[PDB]
Amino acid sequence: MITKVTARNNKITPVELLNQKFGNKINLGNFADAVFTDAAFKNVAGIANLPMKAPVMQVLMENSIVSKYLKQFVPDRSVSFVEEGQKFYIVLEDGQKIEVPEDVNKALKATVSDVKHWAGYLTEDGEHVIDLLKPAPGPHFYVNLLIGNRLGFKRTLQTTPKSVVDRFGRGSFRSHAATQVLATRFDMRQEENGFPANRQFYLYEDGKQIFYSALIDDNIVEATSKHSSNRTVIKYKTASNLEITRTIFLVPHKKGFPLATELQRIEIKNASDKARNLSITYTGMFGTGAVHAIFEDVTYTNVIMQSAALYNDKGEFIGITPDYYPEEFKQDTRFVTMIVRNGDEKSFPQSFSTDYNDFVGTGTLEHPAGGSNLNNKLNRKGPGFFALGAPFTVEPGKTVIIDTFTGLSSSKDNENYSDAVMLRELDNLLRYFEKSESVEETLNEIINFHENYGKYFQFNTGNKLFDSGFNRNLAFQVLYQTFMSRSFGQTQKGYREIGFREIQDLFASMYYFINIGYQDFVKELLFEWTANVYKMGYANHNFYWVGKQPGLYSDDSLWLLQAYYRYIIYTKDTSVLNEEVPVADGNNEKRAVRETLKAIIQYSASISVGDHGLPLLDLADWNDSLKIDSNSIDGATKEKLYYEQLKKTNGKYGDRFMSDYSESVMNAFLLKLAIDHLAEIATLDNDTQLAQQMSELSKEVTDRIQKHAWKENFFARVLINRYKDGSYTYLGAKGDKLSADPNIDGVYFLNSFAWSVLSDVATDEQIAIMVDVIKKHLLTPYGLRLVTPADLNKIANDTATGHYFFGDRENGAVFKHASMMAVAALIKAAKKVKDNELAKEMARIAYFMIDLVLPYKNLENPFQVAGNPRISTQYINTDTGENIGPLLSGTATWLNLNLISLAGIEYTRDGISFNPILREEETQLNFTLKAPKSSYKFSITKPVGFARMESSEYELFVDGQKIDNTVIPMYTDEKEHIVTLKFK
């Protein structure tokens, strides 16, 4: 009877039908747009020859003139618009070509004129300028991320404030952990991160509303938003010639300040020739401290608090704080306050409301009935809605400035905490910002801090979109992720702690922090992770104020050797090996870093190993969904069993934990890398015993992998040991019998390839075979997939590949973080393999993939690829090409590593191993590099074509002296050194 047609099953798209019905009567061009005219999809209305894909028919439909005109034909007749000369026609299926009326021609030309920039544009400095009326490519595209600065203060990692801001200023604002200052929204749409009133305000004249910051109507003649590094600026011009500017940023910490403050400055310039008697009403919604009760008991969230008013020394009202009854919700104290600056005079708000129902009344939030006449009623209940009102007269050509301060004080930074601490910190804050210029100076301080932070590595290529994208935007995103891990963005809203393995973010940012004098902060981060390693070598999978999930995941500890290796090789500071750091086991016990790093390797190399001497997989490793072993155990369960095994069998600590559990080949590669890392560390430490021991275990573990993990045409991913008859014995190479694609023999994991190379196990020949498999079955038009189809239920209890349509996340997406780890491999191999044609090919795939993740390139075809042109996104949908959030991802970290690696920079014990791999079409690459006691200017020139040191003639000069050593010293003479490389 009734039939069902899904979005994906729908037989034909609008543009396909448009091409069918008009393609050989008019030139539809490279891009067109169309909509079905009816719910049965039989006819289309379309428009030919657009500069790019864009929702033009949608905007045309919003236009009363074009809309009414089209009804003379649609829905019963298909039509296409077409421009010839500079005049528009409408074409029918019967060949008629009708010059459209002038008012329609004008509307159509006005609509298509700037389609090329409908998703905004980037400034030379990489700032995203956004039209507030234009449609969004996706829910992450128009988003900026803000962060405070707790460097030099306690618990910098856990207490740095962070904010989400879209083009309209919507979003929310957090202090420590997931503590909400302004309310987050957890509702149906990705686009809604915050309660809708947050950061918004209204203007009134003669009692009538003339402006709302989140409503663009006919009385708004210009409205743009600019997302820059750590601030957002939003500008409006009214038809009445008011010029309104909003600037939003987080206050860097200063002693005595609240733990979190977000400043929004509102500038109102009267660009007309008559004074205007105006008022502002500034609104927002405090987050609840009782976040779980939003789901479980909303009435609880309301009755546990009340509104309270704040008054300065002179008895003047300054703002609002939400007052809580339960002690657990009185350890943070929120506030909002406003200063109105009008020539000489400063004033505080004259009125307030705290009841959303009294505020909106019979109206809407966009048009609130009580917005002009606030009732000065303190709500006995929550929620913590606030409205602050103040009148001002602004003379012709003059500007009034309204500075708002919203934030939170906390016990997390203050002993003997009470709301009295907040009142003192708020006073400190308001006195600091008493003078108008203090706001501008603080913004400039933020700008300069990030400008100086990025000087560690600066491309200068004349592609300013690339230069700014890397030098500024990617540098900021890796800083942001060092503090925030994956815990807070537009759609990352729930209680994420800090994953042990996101120590990865520090792999890239440590060099930046060291080169602005914060080496000690990097050590504090290392020691903090070190303190989440247990005595036996496994690690808490997660930690925030406290660590948890002991040895739950098998890869965690091994990543820390990469962090220590990076730090020790760059700094040559071996002292950290002697630091006494808490063991995660507690009871006030500390272990020297050296012995915890020796323990980490012993856990994965000797204890928690399987039948082949490879590290056990346990619940899973880096790959969230390799739950192969249904009866896994974490490291504390394994510890108690391991010790009773040793007494059962009379064994010795260090013996293999006997089991039939599966093994992770990826952990084997991580371990092998770890062991080489420790050997190099000990060498620099002149620890002769440890360097010999590791150098020898490295050879052993490599033997193990080569012998037991190379499987025909790939390094396998997992070795299976529970089937003594041989039913299944590996996964991740031809012949594993586990594929789920008829045309594919075997399952192939991109990371088996990547980590076999990054750990320096795979031979040139094994690289060639795996790259061929990659080209055939993992390389898509949208990049490198994480894995090929597998049917893992053949050995385990499902709940993995069963959740997503093809193209999303685990059902075959391009996971950009994994794609970047693979690029890191391709780049490492391209520098070293003997076969220059293999190297050329791998460098081609590297740059192909980098081009598909570079955020600024999202503006080339934004309504198809979406993403965000300043901030990385997690994955690409391989069905559509859409870059899909979230906005925090190891993609950014490894992209940074990879581009610096391709520029030729690798730090080794003896200095900088210089080996750049330029693009074939490039003929020069210039960049600057800071070091702690020197700097460098690098210049590389080459003919068009593939050039690399391994296989191309070259001359290398350092400070004008041709040299042969391609390891450039790490200079300490506080001079700039000129490095020139010339390929023939």
Helix ranges (DSSP H) in 833-879: 836-853, 862-865
Q: Which amino acid is at 511?
A: Y
Out of a copy of itself, Cl ion, ligand BGC, none, what residue 295 binds, judged by CB under 5 to 8 A for its kind, is a copy of itself
Our finding on whether 16 is near a copy of itself (CB under 8 A) is no
3-state secondary structure of 247: strand
Which regions of 796-873 does DSSP assign to beta strands (E)?
Answer: 814-815
Terminal CA-to-CA distance of the chain, rounded, Å?
A: 73
Residue 433 as a binder of a copy of itself (CB under 8 A): the answer is no
**38, 102, 589, 624: residue in contact with ligand BGC (rule CB under 6 A):** 624
Residue 148 touches ligand BGC, criterion: CB under 6 A: no
Q: What's the rounded Cα separation, in Å, for the pair 477 and 470?
A: 10
Q: How many whole angstroms separate alpha carbon 769 and alpha carbon 833?
A: 13
Build a one-symbol-per-residue string for 91-130: x at contacts with ligand BGC by CB under 6 A, - elsewhere. Answer: ----------------------------------------
Q: Which of 164, 426, 478, 912 binds a copy of itself (CB under 8 A)?
A: 426
962 binds, among Cl ion, a copy of itself, ligand BGC, none (CB under 5 to 8 A by kind): none
961 binds, among Cl ion, ligand BGC, a copy of itself, none (CB under 5 to 8 A by kind): none
The phi, psi pair for 794, rounded to 5°, reads -60, -10
Q: Which does 349 bind (CB under 5 to 8 A by kind): a copy of itself, ligand BGC, Cl ion, none?
A: a copy of itself
The C-alpha angle with vertex 260 and arms to 257 and 263, in degrees rounded to 5, equals 90
Q: Is 499 in the site for ligand BGC (CB under 6 A)?
A: yes
SS3 state of residue 894:
helix
Residues 461-520 within binding reach of a copy of itself (CB under 8 A): 491, 493-494
Give whichever of 251 and 888 is closer to ligand BGC, judged by the CB atom. 888
- Of the two residues 184 and 353, which places its CB atom closer to Cl ion in the complex? 184
User: How many angstroms separate the CA atoms of 463 and 448, rounded?
Assistant: 23
Query: Per-residue x/- marks for ligand BGC, 193-232, CB under 6 A?
Result: ----------------------------------------
> One symbol per residue from 234 to 273: x for binding a copy of itself (CB under 8 A), - otherwise; what is it?
----------------------------------------
Contact status: 382 vs a copy of itself (CB under 8 A):
yes
Give the list of residues 6+ apart from residue 274 with CB closer than 8 angstroms, or none: 396
Per CB under 8 A, 886 contacts a copy of itself: yes
Which residue number, 215 or 931, has a Cβ lying nearer to a copy of itself?
215
Tell me the closest approach of the beta carbon of residue 508 to Cl ion, in angstroms.
19
CA distance to 142, 232, 240, 580, per residue, from 244 (Å): 20, 14, 12, 56
* Residue 133 binds to a copy of itself (criterion: CB under 8 A): yes
Residues 359 to 378: which contact a copy of itself by CB under 8 A? 361-362, 364, 366, 369-370, 372-373, 375-378
Q: Determine, following the binding rule CB under 6 A, whether residue 785 of this chain makes contact with ligand BGC.
A: no
Planar angle of CA 175, 181, 184, nearest 5 degrees = 105
Segment near a copy of itself (CB under 8 A); pick from 97-105, 188-196, 264-272, 862-870:
188-196
Site for ligand BGC contains 252 (CB under 6 A): no
Which DSSP symbol is given to 831? H
Nearest in space to 59 (alpha carbons), one of 127, 125, 115, 121? 115
Give the 3-state secondary structure of residue 877: coil
Residue 457 Cα distances to 90, 509, 643, 927, angstroms: 54, 11, 50, 7
Q: Which of 54, 79, 143, 183 binds a copy of itself (CB under 8 A)?
A: 183
Q: Does 951 bind a copy of itself (CB under 8 A)?
A: no
Give the contacts of 29 (CB within 8 A, at least 6 positions apart). Answer: 48, 49, 50
What is the smallest separation between the CB atom of 815 and ligand BGC, expressed in angstroms?
A: 5
Q: Kindly state whether residue 647 participates in binding a copy of itself, applying the rule CB under 8 A.
A: no
Q: Checking phi first, is residue 392 left (phi over 0); if not, alpha (psi -120 to 50) or beta? A: beta
Q: C-beta of 499: minimal distance to ligand BGC in Å?
A: 6
User: Does residue 162 belong to the site contacting ligand BGC (CB under 6 A)?
Assistant: no
**Contact stretch for a copy of itself (CB under 8 A) within 347-355, 520-528, 732-740, 962-970:** 347-355
User: Residue 20 is which amino acid?
Assistant: Q
Measured distance CA(666)–CA(617) in Å, rounded: 9
- 420 burial via Cβ count (<10 Å: 0-12, 13-18, 19+): exposed
Q: Which two tokens stand for residue 848?
A: 């192909």
Binding stretches for ligand BGC (CB under 6 A): 486, 499, 622, 624, 815
